[PDB]
Design a binder for this molecule. Sequence first.
Ligand SMILES: Nc1ncnc2c1ncn2[C@@H]1O[C@H](CSCc2cccc(C(=O)O)c2)[C@@H](O)[C@H]1O
Ligand SMILES: [Zn+2]
Ligand SMILES: [Zn+2]
Lengths: 298, 115
Amino acid sequence: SSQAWQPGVAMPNLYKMQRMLLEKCDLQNYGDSATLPKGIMMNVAKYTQLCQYLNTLTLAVPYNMRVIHFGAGSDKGVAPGTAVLRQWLPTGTLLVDSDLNDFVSDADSTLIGDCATVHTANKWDLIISDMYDPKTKNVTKENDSKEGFFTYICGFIQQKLALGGSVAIKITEHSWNADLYKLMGHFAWWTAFVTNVNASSSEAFLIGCNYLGKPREQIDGYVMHANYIFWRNTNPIQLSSYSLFDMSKFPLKLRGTAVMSLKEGQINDMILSLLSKGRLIIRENNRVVISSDVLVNN
Amino acid sequence: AFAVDAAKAYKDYLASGGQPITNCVKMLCTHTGTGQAITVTPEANMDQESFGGASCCLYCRCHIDHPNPKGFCDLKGKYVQIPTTCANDPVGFTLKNTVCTVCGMWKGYGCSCDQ
Ligand SMILES: Nc1ncnc2c1ncn2[C@@H]1O[C@H](CSCc2cccc(C(=O)O)c2)[C@@H](O)[C@H]1O
Ligand SMILES: [Zn+2]
Ligand SMILES: [Zn+2]
């Protein structure tokens, strides 16, 4: 594990190609803990390593980039992950976050409520989700694909992610969705990324890199989650905070990626190739407008 | 004429020996920054910690109005640099101190405009 100086470990391609049956996740390093730098919260460390890994991918980074962050609240009432995203993203990036429960945030705008109540007029260049329901961690019943906020996320990606855009969606052994894995085949590339600080957990971020709006690959999400658990079960990851101590190249490079409005008929193979290399975003460039539905009763 | 004075209440709470507001969001950074007080990205120097601004704002954290006509917050969406010796109480520090308007450092914690 020269992996210990990386921000984390991405699922190796050969594991994605297997056809494993789903098993219980049993991590060798379960219960071990990384020693975090003095006074640093796990969620700051975790998001820092996620962003350090995203720095290695062909993310589209336009001017006036638009980023939305679901599950951004904490039981502490603050938003550590949003604070890391704002540190990472270029100055002037529009950052919106959201959570079921009230919290105080550094985002440009914050919506409180179930994510299913959230609607946006505009499309987005990057979607981050840390949403998680601890009730899913029920080891005594079958581990089937989960709906809930995953259904919202799948629709939100398909309806409101700009072509060329990217996502990072938190999953665990029990918090996962087959359609979301299938949607990973609608990006130019995808992986499941495990942070080195939280490697003792079955958590991963499902990352779709450069959205193409159509299936590039057909993925069976039940098989792929089994493949993910098999990888985790057979590849212990050494807990590590090493990458947190070198922040000199942390900020996301502002690439000024071109943004174009194009109708479905003009997305040819040459456009698809630019999208696939992180060189193009396809969306409108009007105002960012968001809202949360409020149910009225007595 | 009645207005709640949360700043006074927190100062008096601190003086009476109350434990400072916790869970201010401390950032990872190089600690080779400009050391200015309130910045668009973490700028802690060797003697400072950088925090997410909203989490260090008394009014943000207590869910109360900000004390100005506009109700505007000059910490939220920014990063605040706190001297490491004061980082046990970032909210108290920001409440009790002032930013030099010419150099941007904390008066008495980096501002050298008067020597
Ligand atoms: N449908 C939704 N709509 C909007 N928001 C949602 C939705 N579902 C979840 N969330 C939000 O995501 C975050 C999930 S963490 C929960 C957790 C579990 C175990 C340990 C910890 C810990 O850190 O100690 C935290 C919370 O803030 C939660 O409110
Ligand atoms: Zn405030
Ligand atoms: Zn000065």
